[PDB]
């Protein structure tokens, strides 16, 4: 496997978005992973509608601005036969009436693949060979809110209690040594003003820090 | 716990009481009525691009209300905002996202 990966350099990743005051991270994580896989398939990067997911995926077990899961979003896309573009179905950060229209669908999936739970080596393999991967993490700590740069390591982090869904767009290491200071390169959904232009490096191969490999998945396209 | 979901309830701490105090003016504004002290009893948090606190408070006449207070991320330099509230609540009502 590569010692470093950064899917942004290969055109897989849209600009960082902003979920605002809605608990819709799961939808941003899901569209992020789906944007990557659709790009892999077609070579065309198209920003996808988190609002479509928020409004329409309650039958699959999501709860709009009250939370959800990336797997349930990929399932909705499968059962629904599609997902609209952001341009056609824009985000307003509140639960609204489902406006899915099949004629504006620009992505599909056939389900999803779960990465072996807890296994950072499985997660690494997935990142290196598939593309951006949806993950859940423990992001509720003050240290995460205040994050600006470097490798994030929070001794209080849980591998088990995961309150946020984000996107792993690669991995690598700080410094000369490829097995020191390793990190997951993570796209957040709190706008480009947060963290490092909207991104954060999370400690890698440190006992599944903040639960990054606890519940990772990606859509099958 | 789920991504974007609310946490388990936890009994209020002085910080939470503090958030209620800071935000009291805004509530009086919305409801028209004015309050003696509001006792913060319990709360839940929800992580967004910032933080939503859902706080159960007591009006001191055995009346309860549920407040939704948004705390912005570090760089936005914005103070706490009461983004929602529900009135006429039961002491044992579960705090839920709204």
UniProtKB/Swiss-Prot annotation, chain A:
Disulfide bond residue pairs: 22-65, 56-98, 157-210
Transmembrane segments: none
Subcellular localization: Lysosome
MF terms in GO: cysteine-type endopeptidase activity; cysteine-type peptidase activity; serine-type endopeptidase activity
Modes of activity regulation: Inhibited by CST6.
GO biological process entries: antigen processing and presentation of exogenous peptide antigen via MHC class II; extracellular matrix disassembly; proteolysis involved in protein catabolic process
Gene Ontology cellular-component terms listed: extracellular region; extracellular space; lysosomal lumen; lysosome
Residues annotated as glycosylated: 108, 179
Tissue: Predominantly expressed in the thymus and testis. Also expressed in corneal epithelium, and to a lesser extent in conjunctival epithelium and skin.
Record's keyword terms, sorted: Disulfide bond, Glycoprotein, Hydrolase, Lysosome, Protease, Signal, Thiol protease, Zymogen
Enzyme Commission code(s) on record: 3.4.22.43
EC top class named in words: hydrolase
Active site: 25, 164, 188
Reactions listed under catalytic activity: The recombinant enzyme hydrolyzes proteins (serum albumin, collagen) and synthetic substrates (Z-Phe-Arg-NHMec > Z-Leu-Arg-NHMec > Z-Val-Arg-NHMec)
Keyword Hydrolase: yes
Family: Belongs to the peptidase C1 family.
Function of the molecule: Cysteine protease. May have an important role in corneal physiology.
The protein, known as: Cathepsin L2
Full-protein interval shown: 114 to 334 of 334
From Swiss-Prot, chain B:
Keywords recorded for this protein, A-Z: Acetylation, Cell adhesion, Cytoplasm, Ichthyosis, Protease inhibitor, Thiol protease inhibitor
Coiled coil: none
Signal peptide: none
GO biological process, one term: peptide cross-linking
Molecular function via GO: cysteine-type endopeptidase inhibitor activity; protease binding
Pfam families associated with the record: Cystatin (PF00031)
PROSITE patterns for the chain: CYSTATIN
Cellular component, GO annotation: cornified envelope; cytoplasm; cytosol; extracellular space; nucleoplasm; peptidase inhibitor complex
UniProt key word Cytoplasm: yes
Locus of motif Secondary area of contact: 46-50
CDD domains noted in UniProt: CY
Family recorded in the similarity comment: Belongs to the cystatin family.
PANTHER family the UniProt entry points to: CYSTATIN FAMILY MEMBER, CYSTATIN-A
Name of the protein: Cystatin-A
Organism lineage: Eukaryota, Metazoa, Chordata, Craniata, Vertebrata
Gene name for this UniProt entry: CSTA
